[PDB]
Design a protein around this ligand. Structure first.
Ligand SMILES: O=C(O)CNC(=O)C(=O)O
Ligand SMILES: [Mg+2]
Ligand code: NI
Ligand SMILES: [Zn+2]
Length: 331
């Protein structure tokens, strides 16, 4: 079995290998990359996403979110407080202000120490889930707006034609902006491209060990667990690397820099934080290997998770027994 320790693998495809996206995902899996739950892909030196990022300041962040924490430094939740609209240029100025800017630090490990010591005492503001793309239309390789759709993959594998669409989303981050522990909707893959700015640190649990993380989370967040048998779908819970190590949970970490792609694999729990002002693009995708994970994905039916229109068909076709309860949680 390849990659039996479930290490995060880093790939350097050539320009020729960058042509066929599906083929390269299958290649990474042949080398065991999925066992980690996360892989990094460094694009060939000849590739670029677009010409420049000099003209993005007028993008609107309609509903910036202030991420307010509760709990203790290593075990906390966050809620999202809505703020007034602002442009990307206004958000960048805010991220660089004395109140929000990255502190002085020695290296990524020092900044990680500072994040986990001090995150809860601040409330950073995030632009999230903004439909759109910063890939040039003429970028033909690894263009996250031109991928094969999940509806087409389900139709190809299973024969059923369904409604729904699959488009990318932009993220604008600042120091201490935080992504809570989660798997993707319907335990899909994700791909994330860091277009510009400061890094993102990621944490990930191997898919084969995801239930260990779920059991610790039920212990650490006992009221949330009574409220919902899939409360990690709410995307509000944080647990530090120190707490994970104290509890014997297998995980890995890596820092993504501008110009790099990350792929998350089905049922790979992940979390992380941004180092400073940045912009990322991400989308969900599927492969044949996903179908069995989609069929087994947990679901939230308590009302908290609320998701896109296009998830309806996935539940309806892959999880007909669960569909009526889940749809009620959507309504
Ligand atoms: O960059 C972001 O805010 C979030 N993206 C991811 O967690 C992902 O691609 O799965
Ligand atoms: Mg603009
Ligand atoms: Ni994710
Ligand atoms: Zn729920």
């Amino acid at each position: 079995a390849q990659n039996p320790n479930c290490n995060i693998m880093i790939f350097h495809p050539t320009k020729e290998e960058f042509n066929d996206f599906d083929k390269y995902i299958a290649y990474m899996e042949s080398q065991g990359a999925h066992r980690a739950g996360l892989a990094k892909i460094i694009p060939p030196k000849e590739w670029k996403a677009r010409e420049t990022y000099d003209n993005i300041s007028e993008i609107l962040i309609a509903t910036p979110l202030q991420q307010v924490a509760s709990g203790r430094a290593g075990v906390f939740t966050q809620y999202h407080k809505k703020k007034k609209a602002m442009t990307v240029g206004e958000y960048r100025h805010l991220a660089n202000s004395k109140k929000y800017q990255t502190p002085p630090h020695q290296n990524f490990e020092d900044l990680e120490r500072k994040y986990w010591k001090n995150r809860i005492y601040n409330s950073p503001i995030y632009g999230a889930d903004i439909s759109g793309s910063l890939f040039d239309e003429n970028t033909k390789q690894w263009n996250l707006g031109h991928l094969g759709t999940i509806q087409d993959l389900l139709e190809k594998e299973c024969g059923v034609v369904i409604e729904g669409v699959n488009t990318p989303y932009l993220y604008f981050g600042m120091w201490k902006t935080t992504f809570a522990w989660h798997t993707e909707d319907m335990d899909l893959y994700s791909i994330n491209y860091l277009h510009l700015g400061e890094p993102k640190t990621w944490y990930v649990v191997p898919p084969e060990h995801g239930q260990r993380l779920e059991r610790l989370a039920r212990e650490l967040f006992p009221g949330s667990s009574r409220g919902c048998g899939a409360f990690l779908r709410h995307k509000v819970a944080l647990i530090s690397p120190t707490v994970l190590k104290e509890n014997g949970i297998p995980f890995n970490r890596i820092t993504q820099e501008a110009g790099e792609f990350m792929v998350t694999f089905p049922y790979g729990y992940h979390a992380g934080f941004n180092h400073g002002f940045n912009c990322a693009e991400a989308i969900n995708f599927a492969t044949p290997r996903w179908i069995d994970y989609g069929k087994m994905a947990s679901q939230c039916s308590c009302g908290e998770a609320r998701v896109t229109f296009s998830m309806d068909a996935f539940v309806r076709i892959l999880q007909p027994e669960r569909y009526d309860l889940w749809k009620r949680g959507q309504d």
